[PDB]
């Protein structure tokens, strides 16, 4: 699809057998989902933004579907207000910026 | 252009006569630049992101040039880790997400 930026570019994702809304975020290296009980091994991570850092759990090799497009990779899970689709997965779905 | 996301979508901007590098950030409602001097009146404001809320200076109707494209809009200055072009200006240069 083509998503304009008048509004926050929110999409539906499928992850860990759940449907969810997430932000397509060219400003994010990584993918950060709101607290959820993913099964799987994980390691602790700190990630930064505007106001400091939060601790998240890193899960590797996690299959995910973004608006019908399948991908698989690292997902961080922590106390983010918004589901964030970062570049690691945006490249997998063929997403670009165009102007 | 078309811009892929294997690397951070970083661009040169011209603001206030000065060149800087900035990240094209579809996950930001607003444009927030590192500490710098800008001419005009500014209002104190707060914004938030991952890691919490920061204090910023708000400049309205600032012209900025982004990869040769002209915008004039609100620009925020403060302790952001990176110069960030948000949707307020990305809409002005006709930026979309495509996949």
């Amino acid at each position: 699809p083509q998503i304009t930026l008048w509004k926050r570019p929110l999409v539906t994702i499928r992850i860990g057998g759940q449907l969810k809304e997430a932000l397509l975020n060219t400003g994010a290296d990584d993918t950060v989902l709101e607290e959820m009980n993913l099964p799987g091994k994980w390691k602790p991570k700190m990630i930064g933004g505007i106001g400091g850092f939060i601790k998240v759990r890193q899960y590797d090799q996690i299959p995910i579907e973004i608006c019908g497009h399948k991908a698989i990779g690292t997902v961080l899970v922590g106390p983010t207000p918004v589901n964030i689709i970062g570049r690691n997965l945006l490249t997998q779905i063929g997403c670009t910026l165009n102007f | 252009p078309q811009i892929t996301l294997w690397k951070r979508p970083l661009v040169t901007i011209r603001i206030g006569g000065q060149l800087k590098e900035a990240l094209l950030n579809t996950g930001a409602d607003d444009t927030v630049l590192e500490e710098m001097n800008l001419p005009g009146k500014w209002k104190p404001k707060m914004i938030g992101g991952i890691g919490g809320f920061i204090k910023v200076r708000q400049y309205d109707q600032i012209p900025i040039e982004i990869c040769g494209h002209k915008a004039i809009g609100t620009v925020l200055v403060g302790p952001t880790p990176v110069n960030i072009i948000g949707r307020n200006l990305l809409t002005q240069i006709g930026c979309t997400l495509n996949f």
């Binding site: 983010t80 918004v82 | 950030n25 914004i47």
Partner: peptide
């Protein structure tokens, strides 16, 4: 407003 720069 809200600004979701993520540094990984």
């Amino acid at each position: 407003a809200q600004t979701f720069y993520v540094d990984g």
